[PDB]
């Protein structure tokens, strides 16, 4: 189970020189892929309010991201990636305060409805660091373009235990600086931009309740 359940990440807005600097560091373009995700939430965006993200990826399956360090690390920084459907069901019941063995079965009972569906084109780069001669010596950089035109990058470390997260954060920040990402720069998740575009009243309601 070598990869790890915990995503540590930093989103950014790509520029013309991002891939070249990745290459010059020894990074490689591992693949280019296109994937369709459908996201689910209550009409109140209860999951999004709790920094939970539930999606079913075509030809891949369900995933629930939920914060690994809620209240300690800011949103869009660390997520446990839940893919075993019984764990997803348990965590959804927990967050939403509610006999489903699979996620499809729980949507009705929990009041979860489709809130977005869209396709992303991704260039997945990986950087093996120090020729692999260190702990967790691979960082991923995804360069995504959503079908609505939004371009977003993510520098990502996948680790196994919360105790690895501080070091992962440090390495992601250092790689981010080398790719030319301003320290203060933020970039919204694709789903948030989808809501801005196509469900602007939901996006406004989200801003209001999150404050
Ligand atoms: Cl397994
Ligand atoms: Cl995103």
114 is in an annotated binding site: no
Cα 163 to ligand 1 centroid, rounded to whole Å: 22
Instruction: Please give the Cα distance from 173 to 10 (Å, whole number).
Output: 8
Q: What is the DSSP string of 162-201?
A: GGGHHHHHHHHHHHHHHHT--TT-----HHHHHHHHH-HH
Minimum-distance ligand to the CA of 152? 2
136 annotated to bind ligand: no
Q: Distance between CA atoms of 188 and 170, rounded to whole angstroms? A: 21
Hey, which residues does 55 pair with through a beta bridge? 39, 63
Q: Which residues make beta-bridge pairs with 146?
A: 120
User: 11 labelled as ligand-binding?
Assistant: yes
Report the distance separating Cα 170 and Cα 177, nearest Å: 11
Compute the half-sphere exposure of residue 147: CA atoms within 13 Å on the CB side of its CA.
11
Enter the DSSP assignment of 73. B
Separation of 1 CA from ligand 1 center, angstroms? 7
Cβ–Cβ < 8 Å for 110, 93: yes
Number of domains making up the chain = 1
Residue 190 CA to ligand 2 center (angstroms) comes to 4
Residue with tokens 């939430």: 41
Place of tokens 């290459």: 23
Residue 122, annotated as binding a ligand: yes
| Cα(107)–Cα(100) distance, integer angstroms | 9
Between CA 189 and CA 120 the distance in angstroms is 12
Tell me the β-bridge partners of 131: none
* Interatomic CA distance for residues 139 and 126, integer angstroms: 6
Residues 67, 115, 122: CA angle, nearest 5 degrees: 70
Q: How was this structure determined?
A: X-ray
- Was 56 annotated as part of a binding site? no
Q: Which residues contact 104 (CB under 8 A, 6 or more apart)?
A: none
Provide the resolution (angstroms). Answer: 1.5
Distance CA 37, CA 155 (A): 20
Beta strands in the chain (DSSP E): 6-12, 28-41, 53-57, 61-67, 78-82, 113-128, 138-146, 151-159
Query: How many angstroms separate the alpha carbon of residue 99 from the centre of ligand 2?
Result: 31
Is 133 annotated as belonging to a binding site? no
Q: What is the CATH number of the domain that holds 98?
A: 2.40.320.10
- Give residue 102's domain range: 2-211
Tell me the CA–centroid distance for residue 83 and ligand 1, in Å: 10
Query: Which ligand is the nearest neighbour of the Cα of 144?
Result: 2
Shortest-distance ligand to the CA of residue 120: 2
CB 95 within 8 A of CB 111: no
Which ligand is in closest contact with the Cα of 2?
1
9 is in an annotated binding site: yes
Q: Which ligand is nearest to the CA of 11?
A: 2
């Amino acid at each position: 189970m070598a990869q790890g359940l915990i995503e540590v990440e930093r989103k950014f807005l790509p520029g013309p020189g991002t891939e070249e600097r990745l290459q010059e560091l020894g990074g490689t373009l591992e693949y280019r892929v296109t994937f369709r995700d459908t996201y689910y939430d209550t009409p109140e965006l209860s999951l999004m309010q709790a920094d939970h993200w539930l999606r079913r990826r075509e030809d891949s399956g369900w995933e629930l991201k939920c914060p690994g360090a809620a209240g300690v690390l800011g949103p869009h920084t660390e997520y446990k990636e839940l893919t075993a459907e019984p764990t997803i069901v348990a965590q959804l019941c927990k967050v939403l305060r509610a006999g489903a063995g699979d996620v499809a079965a729980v949507l009705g009972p929990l009041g979860l409805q489709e809130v977005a569906s869209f396709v992303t084109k991704r260039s997945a780069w990986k950087l093996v660091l120090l020729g692999a001669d260190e702990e967790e010596p691979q960082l991923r950089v995804d360069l995504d373009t959503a079908d609505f035109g939004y371009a977003v990058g993510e520098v990502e470390a996948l680790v196994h235990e919360e105790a690895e997260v501080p070091t992962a954060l440090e390495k992601i920040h250092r790689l981010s600086s080398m790719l030319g990402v301003p320290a203060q720069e933020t970039a919204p998740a694709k789903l948030i931009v989808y809501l801005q575009r196509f469900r602007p009243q939901d996006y406004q309601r989200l801003l209001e309740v999150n404050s």
